[PDB]
C-alpha cells in the first residue's frame, strides 16, 4: 500500500527511497535503472521496489477527517 | 463528564448528542456519526 | 392482463342484477434515482455507502 | 442593579454565544442580554433589544453569520454585528457608562432581583434538547451563507 520501511529478506531500509525512485520514474528510466541509480544491487533489495504498489495515492482520494 | 460528543460523517465536525438525542450532525443533518476516539490510554509496541 | 372486476350481485333488487364492474390498466412506468427518506419522509439521495452504513437497501422507488 | 459585578450574569460571552448562534427562538435568547461592544477611553455595555438582518456575512470563530443585532445604549439604538462583542467581563466604569446612558434617556432602570428570571433562560438555552424538527431550519442557516460542497 505504502512503501515498506525495510527489505523483507535482508533488512536494508527501502522506505526512504520511494520518493527518490518516483523522481527517477518521472523520466524514461526502466524500473531497473532507478534501482541502479539508488545503488540497490542484490535482487533481494531490488524486488522490494520493483514489486511495490503505491496504493496510498488512492487512499488519499477519500474525504478528510478535519 | 460528557455531553456525548460525536463526529459527523460528511461534516467531520464534533456534534453534541446527549443521551436519547438523535444522532444527526449540527450541519447538513446527516444521520451518520462516529464515536470520537477514546480518551482512554492507547499504546502499541510497534512490533 | 388489465384487471376487470365485477361487483357481486346482492340481488337486493329482487332481479338478476347486471352489477357494475371496475377495470384497471397499467400504462407508463417511472423509476426514480436512489432515494433515501429520513424517518420524516424527507427525500435525500441514497448513496451506496449510506445504505451500507445504515443497513439500508440500495433501492430506488418505482 | 447597583453593582458592576452582577450585570455579568446576563452578559453573553463569545465562546458560548457562537454555540448559541443557532439556538432556536434566538430572538427569545438574546433579547434582554448585555454585551461588551467595541465602537479614546469610551466603551459601552449595550442593551440587546432585537435581532435584525445585515447583508454582510462575517465569521464568528468557525461559524459565519449575516445576522445583525439591534443594540441600544440608552438613546443610541442601531444594528451591530457579532464582531465588536468581546468575551471579557464588565469593568466598573463601563457599567456606570450604561447607568449614565439610562439616566440620560429617562428609561426605567432594572431592579436588582429582576435578573433571576433572565439568567435562568440561558441555562435552559444551553441545556436545550435537540429532539424536534430543528434539523431543517438549523442546516438551512449554514447552507444559506456557506457553499454546498464543504
Ligand atoms: Zn535486500
Ligand atoms: Zn453533518
UniProtKB/TrEMBL annotation, chain A:
It comes from the Eukaryota. It is found in: Nucleus. Pfam families: RNA_pol_N. One of its GO terms (biological process) is DNA-templated transcription. Keywords: DNA-directed RNA polymerase, Metal-binding, Transcription, Zinc. GO terms for molecular function: DNA binding; DNA-directed RNA polymerase activity; zinc ion binding. HAMAP family: RNApol_arch_Rpo10. Belongs to the archaeal Rpo10/eukaryotic RPB10 RNA polymerase subunit family. DNA-dependent RNA polymerase catalyzes the transcription of DNA into RNA using the four ribonucleoside triphosphates as substrates. Common component of RNA polymerases I, II and III which synthesize ribosomal RNA precursors, mRNA precursors and many functional non-coding RNAs, and a small RNAs, such as 5S rRNA and tRNAs, respectively. This is DNA-directed RNA polymerases I, II, and III subunit RPABC5.
From TrEMBL, chain B:
It comes from Sus scrofa. The chain holds residues 12 to 58 of 58 of the full protein. Keywords: DNA-directed RNA polymerase, Metal-binding, Nucleus, Transcription, Zinc, Zinc-finger. Its main location: nucleus. One of its GO terms (biological process) is transcription by RNA polymerase II. GO terms for molecular function: DNA binding; DNA-directed RNA polymerase activity; zinc ion binding. Belongs to the archaeal Rpo12/eukaryotic RPC10 RNA polymerase subunit family. It is found in: Nucleus, Nucleolus. This is DNA-directed RNA polymerases I, II, and III subunit RPABC4.
Automatic annotation (TrEMBL), chain C:
It is found in: Nucleus. It comes from the Eukaryota. Transmembrane segments: none annotated. RNA-dependent RNA polymerase that catalyzes the extension of a non-coding RNA (ncRNA) at the 3'-end using the four ribonucleoside triphosphates as substrates. An internal ncRNA sequence near the 3'-end serves as a template in a single-round Pol II-mediated RNA polymerization reaction. May decrease the stability of ncRNAs that repress Pol II-mediated gene transcription. DNA-dependent RNA polymerase catalyzes the transcription of DNA into RNA using the four ribonucleoside triphosphates as substrates. Belongs to the RNA polymerase beta chain family. This is DNA-directed RNA polymerase subunit beta.
Amino acid at each position: 500500500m505504502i512503501i515498506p520501511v525495510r527489505c523483507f529478506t535482508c533488512g536494508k531500509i527501502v522506505g526512504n527511497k520511494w520518493e527518490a525512485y518516483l523522481g527517477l520514474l518521472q523520466a524514461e528510466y526502466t524500473e531497473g535503472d532507478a534501482l541502479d541509480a539508488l545503488g540497490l544491487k542484490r535482487y533481494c533489495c531490488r524486488r522490494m521496489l520493483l514489486a511495490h504498489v503505491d496504493l496510498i495515492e488512492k487512499l488519499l482520494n477519500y474525504a478528510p477527517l478535519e | 463528564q460528557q455531553p456525548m460528543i460525536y463526529i459527523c460523517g460528511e461534516c467531520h465536525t464534533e456534534n453534541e448528542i446527549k443521551s436519547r438525542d438523535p444522532i444527526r450532525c449540527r450541519e447538513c443533518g446527516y444521520r451518520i456519526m462516529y464515536k470520537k476516539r477514546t480518551k482512554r490510554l492507547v499504546v502499541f509496541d510497534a512490533r | 392482463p388489465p384487471i376487470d372486476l365485477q361487483a357481486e350481485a346482492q340481488h337486493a333488487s329482487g332481479e338478476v342484477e347486471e352489477p357494475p364492474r371496475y377495470l384497471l390498466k397499467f400504462e407508463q412506468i417511472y423509476l426514480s434515482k436512489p432515494t433515501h427518506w429520513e424517518r420524516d419522509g424527507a427525500p435525500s439521495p441514497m448513496m451506496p455507502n449510506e445504505a451500507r452504513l445504515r443497513n439500508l437497501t440500495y433501492s430506488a422507488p418505482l | 442593579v447597583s453593582l458592576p459585578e452582577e450585570l455579568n450574569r446576563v452578559r453573553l460571552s463569545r465562546h458560548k454565544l457562537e454555540r448559541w448562534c443557532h439556538m432556536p427562538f434566538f430572538a427569545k435568547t438574546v433579547t434582554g442580554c448585555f454585551v461588551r461592544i467595541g465602537i479614546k477611553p469610551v466603551y459601552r455595555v449595550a442593551e440587546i433589544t432585537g435581532v435584525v438582518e445585515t447583508a454582510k456575512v462575517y465569521q464568528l470563530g468557525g461559524t459565519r453569520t449575516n445576522k445583525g443585532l439591534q443594540l441600544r445604549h440608552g438613546n443610541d439604538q442601531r444594528v451591530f454585528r457579532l464582531e465588536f462583542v468581546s468575551n471579557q467581563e464588565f469593568t466598573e466604569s463601563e457599567f456606570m457608562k450604561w447607568k449614565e446612558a439610562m439616566f440620560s434617556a429617562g428609561m426605567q432602570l432594572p431592579t436588582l432581583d429582576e435578573i433571576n428570571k433572565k439568567e435562568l433562560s440561558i441555562k435552559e438555552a444551553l441545556n436545550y434538547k435537540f429532539n424536534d424538527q430543528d434539523i431543517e431550519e438549523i442546516v438551512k442557516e449554514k447552507e444559506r451563507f456557506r457553499k454546498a460542497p464543504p
